[model samples]
Target: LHKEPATLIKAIDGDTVKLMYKGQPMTFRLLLVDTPETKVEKYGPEASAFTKKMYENAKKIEVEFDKGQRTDKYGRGLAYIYADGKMVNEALVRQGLAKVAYVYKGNNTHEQLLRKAEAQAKKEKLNIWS
Candidate 1:
């Protein structure tokens, strides 16, 4: 994986994260794993809690981009986030705090993993699934 090593500056929410990308500070609105924070009832903050805690606990953080997806046309950044040798993007889905969606083409190599995690969450009727 051609992952770009970065530092976790902060997590705006489960969906959006701020990081030190290539020496410059950039924020990434995670591609497929969508966080529902503030959009619904009380089902969203957990995602944020998970993300914030995850970033804090992680030993190392990094981001990896897929082909045809780097920055959004809106001038912000978007990509997959990795923390402490694990996939934070998938972890959200695994926890059922986020949903796998917004597939607009490009390289989605980990879509299956995301869906698998989502499926497991659904199987257990996790937060969002329940």
Candidate 2:
């Protein structure tokens, strides 16, 4: 498998992340969803906690390129992030820790799968909901 290297610098909001790639600062917003802000009940601290648990020491991640919508106002690359052969974004939704908040046409590659996971989690009352 082909690989490119990037260092996860910091978390920007719930679904966005900043990284240092090849000496350049690159920020990416995990596409298709938004989680609760850091101050929104159940979702706030929970999102931060989950992200930290998964990414605090995650320096090297492999991003798989996919279709992107218009660049955000900040010009960060709005793309999907994959790590350890899994889609981190979908993992969040599947775990019912987040909801798919945005749907910009043709970007539902993993939507059904994630929704199924979300339903299961919701049924099981997983994460902060439990």
Candidate 3:
């Protein structure tokens, strides 16, 4: 995996963000997590709100990319995001704000971790699971 220091410019939703990486604007979709669609799904606004709150409170943010394929078909960087030393992607799942949505071919480094977090969230009946 490759890491890049980043600044959170905006939260597009629970699972996507706009960032400034290396002084250039970029969009990053959180790897392995998918939240409700803000335009068409229940809990969407809540998820976005939660993500915005997290970024707003963070003092530092970074993006990590898998070895194979840095961007998705949509041209957004597929990444694992960290805010203040914590994995924001995992946090979203743990808090029931998002679900483990994709495991890339040959790049499942955090897939199991995210899945476990989702399972815990479901077991606890948090957010969408509730």
Candidate 4:
């Protein structure tokens, strides 16, 4: 986990956020999870609300990068966000608010744990999985 200090700027959606990193604004897409589209999709609003709630409740926030590529093709930083010691990406999957997305081969340190959480969410029929 390559942890970097950051300040929450805003929650762009369920799986995307804007942050102030190194005194500059940067876009961060949560790694290993994809939430419903907030623009034109089912459960979008609920997913967005969940993300906003997590962001607002976070007393401290940090961006944790995978060992692979730091940024995606779109220049958004790929990261796992931690808020008050909780991994937000994992929480989203565990709560059934998101699904596992792109897992980088040979670089995903949390792949097993994340997939397990997703499976549990599916079994429990939580949120989007319902």
Write down the lDDT of every candidate, Cα atoms only: 0.84, 0.68, 0.86, 0.87
- Report clash pairs, candidate 2: none
TM-score head-to-head 2 vs 4, winner: 4
For candidate 1, write residues 65-109 as lDDT tens digits.
887667887766878888887888998999999889867567587
Models 1 onward score TM values of 0.92, 0.78, 0.93, 0.94
In model 3, the Cα lDDT at residue 25 comes to 92
| Tens digit of per-residue lDDT, candidate 2, span 1-130 | 2335666778766687787766888887777767777746667677766766566655457654445453577787666676655667877877766877656645566667777777787888877447
**Residue 89 in candidate 3 has what lDDT?**
89
Provide the lowest-lDDT 10-residue window in model 1.
Answer: 34-43
Segments of candidate 3 deviating more than 4 angstroms: none
lDDT of 3 by residue, 1-130 (tens): 7567899788888778999999999998888888998866988898888889888899988889876677888889888888888898899899898889867755578899999999999999999899
State how far residue 62 of model 3 sits from its true place (Å).
0.8
Model 4 over residues 77-100: C-alpha lDDT tens digits?
A: 888999888899999999998999
Clashes within 3 Å, all models in order: 0, 0, 0, 0
Better of 1 and 4 by lDDT: 4
> Which stretches of candidate 4 lie above 4 Å from their native place?
none
Off by over 4 Å in 1: none
